[PDB]
Amino acid sequence: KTVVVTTILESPYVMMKKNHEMLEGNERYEGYCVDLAAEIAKHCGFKYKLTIVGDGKYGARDADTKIWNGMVGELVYGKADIAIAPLTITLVREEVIDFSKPFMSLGISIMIKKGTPIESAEDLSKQTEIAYGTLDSGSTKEFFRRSKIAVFDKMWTYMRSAEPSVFVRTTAEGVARVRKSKGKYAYLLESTMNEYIEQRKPCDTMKVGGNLDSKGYGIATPKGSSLRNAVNLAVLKLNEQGLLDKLKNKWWYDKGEC
Amino acid sequence: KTVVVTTILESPYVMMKKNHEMLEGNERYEGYCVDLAAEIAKHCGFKYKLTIVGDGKYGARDADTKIWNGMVGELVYGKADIAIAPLTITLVREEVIDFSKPFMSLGISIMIKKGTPIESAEDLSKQTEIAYGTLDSGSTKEFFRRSKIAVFDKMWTYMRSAEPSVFVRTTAEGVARVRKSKGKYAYLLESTMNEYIEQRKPCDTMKVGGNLDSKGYGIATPKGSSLRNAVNLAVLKLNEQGLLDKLKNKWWYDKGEC
Numbered sequence A, B: 001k002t003v004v005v006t007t008i009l010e011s012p013y014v015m016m017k018k019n020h021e022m023l024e025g026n027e028r029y030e031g032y033c034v035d036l037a038a039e040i041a042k043h044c045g046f047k048y049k050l051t052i053v054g055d056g057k058y059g060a061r062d063a064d065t066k067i068w069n070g071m072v073g074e075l076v077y078g079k080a081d082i083a084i085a086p087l088t089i090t091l092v093r094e095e096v097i098d099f100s101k102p103f104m105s106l107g108i109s110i111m112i113k114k115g116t117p118i119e120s121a122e123d124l125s126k127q128t129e130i131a132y133g134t135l136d137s138g139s140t141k142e143f144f145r146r147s148k149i150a151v152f153d154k155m156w157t158y159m160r161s162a163e164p165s166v167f168v169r170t171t172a173e174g175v176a177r178v179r180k181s182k183g184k185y186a187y188l189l190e191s192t193m194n195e196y197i198e199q200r201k202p203c204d205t206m207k208v209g210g211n212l213d214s215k216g217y218g219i220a221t222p223k224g225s226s227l228r229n230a231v232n233l234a235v236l237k238l239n240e241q242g243l244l245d246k247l248k249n250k251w252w253y254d255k256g257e258c
């Protein structure tokens, strides 16, 4: 049986090939997670179909309806068999889906337009001239909503009521808002994506300060999946071979434009 | 029932208190993993007994007998219920025990005596004047034994036949060898331990170069354990609260002395 993979268009994890219009099926896509999916499938002995999550989201439980959206919802409601994506391992997600051991580390980080007078989360929290926000329906927004740490809770109180809205629907939208806001918007996003974007033309953004937390991305399966064990061992093998490190270098720094 | 915890004397994870002779049971010990054990036990609702692994080893399958030693052996053969220690998550261990998601990240790293003319693994591999080695019966030795990467395989070929032996029984022994060898021994160990020792008097050692790999420590349970799920969720909760970060700062840098 074909394993249905849910994933998300997020550079450099999954991207449309320039010539995608000329291609069919899995061959339309390229990136770190496209390469990882091929390796996991080879090691576990399955055939698969890459599908892009219909709503373009990572996944959160909707405030009103209590229904999971994004890739998490695709797994919870039986629409996909596995998620191979930069999907953060969290407690509330582990209650409803399984994760492999992590394939990549990350932490929440700050993106600024170059020259913005901000060095830290504390700096952001102590001012309002420079607006700041996060992606909707993902782990970064939930980090601020749940944090008991004074600085991060102060940031949440500001973000949740800021006008106009500081939240964005996609990473690309956060990046565009940093680039177009003349230093007046800073974006909170994962260090992996921040570091990729810092390498991309026109190299007008950068990561500042330390990471706010430390966590990982994992390959997720629905509870009860027969794939769980083999997928986990395959991630460990690919790490131990240095293949995950090779893929990070390939997609972050061999594509590097500054 | 009392949960029997296997752990290892490895600073700053588990250390004898200065006044341990005056104390009984769990109260004899202090450190990051002592604090972590108390938190995991509280969150999972169990009472526990800290025990120090009899052979002082992390764990490997003996070449001759194929019997697991160290903390891994304590779990495999039913002597302990859980390992709470800086125990690296590896494929061959995941086949025989379970691990939580990681509670800390690390990579293999190089420790030198200050002023040693070495900056990288490649530098070590291209010379023999400065001897270099690893801990026995752990994940670092196995990394070199199994590596297909040219520089690391060259290092393995040298280490496995070097005279006198470059391998040590405990981290303390590797550190002592670096300190007493006047620059003529470099020690390959995890970045966590390397960074701790760089802060300790007399501040005569340091970490050089990048990490050789990227991996994690996990809390381990024997296959079939009823503790597996609750332990994993407790690690995720402690991470999400910032408690793991607080404990790292407590044991590495709040008592650090350079």
Ligand SMILES: CC(C)(C)c1ccc(C2=CC=CN3CCS(=O)(=O)N=C23)cc1
Binding pocket: A101, A102, A103, A104, A105, A106, A214, A215, A216, A217, A236, A239, B089, B101, B102, B103, B104, B105, B106, B214, B215, B216, B217, B239
């Ligand atoms: C949550 C923290 C503690 C920050 C963490 C620790 C380690 C990793 C990790 C990164 C890359 C590869 N691997 C291999 C599987 S692993 O050993 O389970 N962990 C990793 C990620 C996050």
Ligand SMILES: N[C@@H](CCC(=O)O)C(=O)O
Binding pocket: A058, A059, A086, A087, A088, A089, A135, A137, A138, A139, A140, A141, A188, A189, A190
């Ligand atoms: N990796 C995140 C999405 C990005 C973010 O929230 O910053 C998730 O799995 O929700």
Ligand SMILES: N[C@@H](CCC(=O)O)C(=O)O
Binding pocket: B058, B059, B086, B087, B088, B089, B135, B137, B138, B139, B140, B141, B188, B189, B190
């Ligand atoms: N953490 C390692 C021990 C230290 C090392 O091998 O450098 C293990 O679990 O085997």
